[PDB]
Amino acid sequence: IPVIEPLFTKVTEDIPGAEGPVFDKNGDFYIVAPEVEVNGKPAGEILRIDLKTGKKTVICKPEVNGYGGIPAGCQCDRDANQLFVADMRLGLLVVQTDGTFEEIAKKDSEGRRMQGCNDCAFDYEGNLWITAPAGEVAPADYTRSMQEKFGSIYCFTTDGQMIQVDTAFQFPNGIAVRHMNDGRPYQLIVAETPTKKLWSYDIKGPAKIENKKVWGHIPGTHEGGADGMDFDEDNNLLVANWGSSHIEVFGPDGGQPKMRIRCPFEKPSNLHFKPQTKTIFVTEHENNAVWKFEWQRNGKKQYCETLKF
Ligand SMILES: NP(=O)(OC1CCCC1)OC1CCCC1
Ligand SMILES: [Ca+2]
Ligand SMILES: [Ca+2]
């Protein structure tokens, strides 16, 4: 398997558990710091980064009823410049660029308590697919499915329904949606970190998935595995393989990696393309920093880049 070693340029550092890199509709860059703690309690932050200087600005430190959050993944909305943030303690949040936020749901469509979320991905129809590796949201005691299989997958529909679409995952993490050339949602790809597997489902409609299948295999026997992922314009799936110093590159059909990208750090966590460029920003947990490197082609357009009209 071919391995490339592109030039990585440091953007910023000192961001505990650097995760969820994302660009909003104005081109501003944000990342989350899930591991920031105060007096031993979660006090996660959402930050805006100045790409020119690397200076950081905390725009939101989510907390609900005295319970701090652990923000871990982001997606920018299309019809409004707001961020949807997956939080391991608070569930799903909607954050405005001014720092104000709102809790989306405490319970799902079946009346069951919401589970803590890790990452999310919009399909072009506007539905948000979310991974939930944690147990019940605060005030419930914090727990995670790294050992036991209780991680779930949700779909937050355009008509505002929070539906659990599947469960029994051992730490579902990264997630992505493969679209057809005509823009129709085709497959849902979900990373199960410790098992070194990538799973896929056929998307039949909003919150409707079938044919669960082992889609790809993540290399290595190291502790960790697939974390964050995203597609490039040719539908190649780039996956951060936390713990193995590489970002794996899978072809549209999955299976085994077709190429690997060697990183100058052991723990790549998540990534995101800068709109209309080949530039990929990567967060990593060895130095808790953000880097950028040039890929071979542009990234697949995110939902926020599409036009409603
Ligand atoms: N980056 P993440 O999705 O998973 C990595 C840490 C566990 C192994 C891979 O976890 C984030 C949420 C909890 C804090 C960091
Ligand atoms: Ca993650
Ligand atoms: Ca991303």
UniProtKB/Swiss-Prot annotation:
Effect listed in the UniProt record for changing residue 242 to L: 62% decrease in activity
Enzyme Commission code: 3.8.2.2
Effect of residue 242 to F: 44% decrease in activity
Residues annotated to bind Ca(2+) 2: 230, 271-272
Biotechnology: Has potential application in bio-remediation by detoxification of organo-phosphates used in insecticides or nerve agents used in chemical warfare such as soman, tabun and sarin.
Cofactor names: Ca(2+)
Temperature-dependence annotation: Optimum temperature is 35 degrees Celsius.
Cofactor: how and how many bound: Binds 2 calcium ions per subunit.
Transmembrane segments annotated in the record for this chain: none
Reported impact of residue 19 to Q: 100% decrease in activity. Loss of calcium 1 binding
Keywords assigned: Calcium, Hydrolase, Metal-binding
Phenotypic consequence of residue 285 to F: 36% decrease in activity
Outcome after substituting residue 35 to Q: 50% decrease in activity
Record field: pH dependence: Optimum pH is 8.0.
Effect of residue 242 to H: 27% decrease in activity
Active site: residue positions: 285
InterPro entries, A to Z: 6-blade_b-propeller_TolB-like, SGL, SMP-30/CGR1_Lactonase
Reported effect, residue 75 to Y: 6% increase in activity
Binding site for Ca(2+) 1: 19, 118, 173, 227
Subunit structure: Monomer.
Full protein name: Diisopropyl-fluorophosphatase
Species for this entry: Loligo vulgaris
